[PDB]
Design a binder for this molecule. Structure first.
Ligand SMILES: CCN1CCN(C2CCN(C(=O)COc3ccc(-c4ccccc4)cc3)CC2)CC1
Ligand SMILES: CCN1CCN(C2CCN(C(=O)COc3ccc(-c4ccccc4)cc3)CC2)CC1
Lengths: 533, 535
């Protein structure tokens, strides 16, 4: 009976488990409930705080994954399976996990809260790549991660209605944040030093907590990895949210009250089965149910809020991987596949752009094609394929990120920017995809320190650097070592110098302008093109 | 006769000529200057097509340059070499349709290739008698026969009331053609080969050449062509009949004037009256825009140049084309606020936006912003030096480089053999400020070989450079290949193809082959922006 593995939170007692990490043991408390199960009548509803419990609750295993669509494009393929649920699915899923060093921290410790991604339709805190044992052991951090409702269960909304107000998936996150404030001190964590970090839909979520005032009192620093609250995919309007909900209802056999009633009486899979068939266009990087501009959680559009927000005492770390768009091409764009080199014609390229940019008018689409064409080699299938990836990557991530970083820096925020350019030696996706969306994560969480995963010895050294950057940023709001000299230093991103760094096997290198001319095209011109048409 | 130089006496279809023996650095040449090739386009013949010169009696003196065609004269920088060198160096008059001939002294044994120069000047100015068009160097050093003609400019050359009898338009181009016909009939008398005639010209002259390529009756008067910093396609080289009709009618009103009655009244006006008003009819505040230019009349030009270059067959055509490095800089000091030759012309972003509207006068607010955003340096969007050099590039790319790029592209794709160059050497003798780099028209003095004249204070390297280019141009006229067959040691100048898009740098250093002429940027101007003005 290890007293290190025993903790009293406000809801009662927990029994953690001692886990072996390469450099030593860590105390893990997995599967802690922070909310009443959002089941039956609580479907589509805001989460309620967990009722106290008797005795000692067993917090030694990962709990269920929020009911969600499971990918099927490449059954058995490791590259896809690493993102699929690794526990049983259930609407009863609102549990969070906690890692601390072993022994428990003597002094109050910085808290890292991970918010996973998955297009707001998938994901789980129990995936191996989110294993928080390495950060807790090496950097002496307290890591926290929560499940939150995805898909219809988390973001289906009939705006203005009482029984489906929307954004409950975000409120799931917010409640887990409140839990950390109220309870993390018992784990040796410092609630006055909470750093949110997430990836993809997770990064966008972190961003929405930045833009929602009630959330702001629950953290001190933020990290957005390859995702933003602004951009074409992270949010929908109230009108469009109301449209998709009513269509899904129709697709399953269903006054707002009475319509949501019928949906509550439907097996979880019946909703998921029709989840993807409510999208207005054929598209990639588009997600049926996502956060909504409701005037509540989001008082206005993210664009509006980032444009007029005071970010005076905020510190943020943002970045992208080298190939943000490649992953999405094999999931809808004809000509692409993980199994060949996906060399495409110029014709396929024009077609894919209508899919990568479902919003674009004919003129706007052609403007994209003409901008991304290599007029020295306009027919070269390699360039066209690599260009199709860039259109998607830049439209959906890089330039949304560049825009956000610009607005934040300009309006008083402290900003550090990176680009991640190392491809894992263990990667199973083809070489033409390069460094796909999501594959910085395993390095930040320090999995290469696990010798069994067959990572190269250089990657282990690389992973330790990144863990240092992230945790130094968590401790201080500055990823730079307060002990290291020549390197050189990671400088703040500013609207003037626009400096960012490259994260790879080679030392930090400072560059300037994050695809500036291309993002000028996406962020300044094309909007004018659909604001006149 | 009796005591004249027997090499300086020559007969042509219209009578006898007395040429003059001229000194060049390397020896003598024969010059026959001021040869009339048309009846004076005066009185009732104003705005009318040229009638061939009626034969004369006796020996016409052909030893000095004749009158310069009536035209506006630059007054922006009085007493400044940079402007004076382009200004008329003879008397202005409507009686101006004469041409000039240089030949080796003595005239050559076998018939020699003929070069015909067509001067530029925005179709509103120019003269074949300018020092920079001196054909004595090409004749002496390369053994070439060099011809240059005066052609009517401004209203006298291009004012059109399309469909009318008394003002059909393009008469300025018909002057050029008549001179080409004159060469076909008479140049043999000078030892020139009428079967090997190469046209070459700059700016509005290069455009003119392109028009002769695209006009059938002219195609039988030459065999090869060179276009320097100009094209018949593009925004300034032509106008619609409707537009020409409007500009003509407006000018009439501005001086106090049924097409017949209107033209008749214009013919009663002093020549200076017309010049004093021709600039006041431009639809906008603009640079690199000229009031009276070739019109698409459906006659000389059966259709728009863009149309004809896109559909025409050019298999049997060989053409040499190119640009200078800073095509647009010259034009900024002539109407973009913030620019001058006497300061560094560092401008603000606001002035850049304003300049774009003047340099792209036919653009919407959207089109204009697209230009600005395309040409902005987003790492330094406020940097005045980058904004200044961007304004030059916008004007340069829109008016010359991308029209030339389009032209080379279409011609190569449709059978033509195309050679492409960029000229990057700034004359050490240049009096324009350094920020202008290599401006519009300052390759010419090197092509004509002026550096070979020791009294002009060029560097020795420039003298070798000039000789090298004279070889390129004359080799091309001689063979349809600027390369020297004898010399394979030197780097070759490859034809421009759609595939490789090869072209050469022309400077003090040896030939360097590059690929794509503003490929990305010209995709913007030639593919995107047109389809933006389709909305
Ligand atoms: C956290 C990092 N993650 C996020 C994204 N990554 C992949 C997974 C799936 N993606 C899609 O766009 C799904 O598209 C579709 C489209 C259609 C259907 C479908 C639905 C019903 C019937 C048939 C097909 C399913 C998925 C993006 C790329 C994996 C790693
Ligand atoms: C053969 C190579 N050439 C071609 C062009 N080069 C210069 C000369 C003048 N340019 C103009 O656009 C004139 O503009 C204007 C605008 C307005 C007025 C004006 C008219 C009436 C009253 C006041 C001003 C005059 C000229 C272009 C750049 C010189 C060498």
């Amino acid at each position: 009976e290890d007293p290190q593995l025993l903790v009293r939170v406000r809801g009662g007692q927990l029994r953690g488990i001692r886990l072996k990490a390469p450099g030593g043991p860590v105390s893990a408390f997995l599967g802690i409930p922070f909310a009443e199960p959002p089941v039956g009548s609580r479907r589509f509803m805001p989460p309620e705080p967990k009722r106290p419990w008797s005795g000692v609750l067993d917090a030694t295993t990962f709990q269920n994954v929020c009911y969600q669509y499971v990918d099927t494009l490449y059954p058995g393929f490791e590259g896809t399976e690493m993102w699929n649920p690794n526990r049983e699915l259930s609407e009863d899923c609102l549990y969070l996990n906690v890692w601390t060093p072993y022994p428990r921290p003597a002094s109050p410790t910085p808290v890292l809260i991970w918010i996973y991604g998955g297009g707001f339709y998938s994901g789980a805190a129990s995936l191996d790549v989110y294993d928080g044992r390495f950060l807790a052991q090496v950097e002496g951090a307290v890591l926290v991660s929560m499940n939150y409702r995805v898909g219809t269960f988390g973001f289906l909304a009939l705006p203005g209605s009482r029984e489906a107000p929307g954004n409950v998936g975000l409120l799931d996150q917010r409640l887990a944040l409140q839990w950390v404030q109220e309870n993390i001190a018992a784990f040796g964590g410092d609630p006055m030093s909470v750093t949110l970090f997430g990836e993809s839909a997770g990064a966008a979520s972190v961003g929405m907590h930045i833009l929602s005032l009630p959330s702001r009192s629950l953290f001190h620093r933020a990290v957005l990895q390859s995702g933003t609250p602004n951009g074409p995919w992270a949010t929908v309007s109230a009108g469009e949210a109301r449209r998709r909900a009513t269509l899904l209802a129709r697709l399953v056999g269903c006054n707002d009250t009475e319509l949501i009633a019928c949906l509550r009486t439907r097996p979880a899979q019946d909703l998921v089965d029709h989840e993807w068939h409510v999208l207005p266009q054929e598209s990639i990087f588009r997600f049926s149910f996502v956060p909504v501009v409701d005037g509540d959680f989001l008082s206005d559009t993210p664009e509006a809020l980032i444009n007029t927000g005071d970010f005076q005492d905020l510190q943020v770390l943002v970045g992208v991987v080298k190939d943000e768009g490649s992953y999405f091409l094999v999931y809808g764009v004809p000509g692409f596949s993980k199994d060949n080199e996906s060399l495409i014609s110029r014709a396929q390229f024009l077609a894919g752009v209508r899919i990568g940019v479902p919003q674009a008018s004919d003129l706007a689409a052609e403007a994209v094609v003409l901008h991304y064409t290599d007029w020295l080699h306009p027919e070269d299938p390699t360039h066209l394929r690599d260009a199709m990836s860039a259109v998607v990557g830049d439209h959906n991530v890089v330039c949304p990120v560049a825009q956000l970083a610009g607005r934040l820096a300009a309006q008083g925020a402290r900003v550090y920017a990176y680009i991640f350019e190392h491809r894992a030696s263990t990667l199973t996706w083809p070489l033409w995809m390069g460094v796909p969306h999501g594959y910085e994560i395993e390095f930040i969480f320090g999995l290469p320190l696990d010798p069994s995963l067959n990572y190269t010895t250089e990657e282990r050294i690389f992973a330790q650097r990144l863990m240092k950057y992230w945790t130094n940023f968590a401790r201080t709001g500055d990823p730079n070592d307060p002990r290291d000299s020549k390197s050189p230093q990671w400088p703040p991103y500013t609207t003037a110098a626009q400096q960012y760094v490259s994260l790879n096997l080679k030392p930090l290198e400072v560059r300037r302008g994050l695809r500036a001319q291309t993002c000028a095209f996406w962020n300044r011109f094309l909007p004018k093109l659909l604001s006149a048409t």
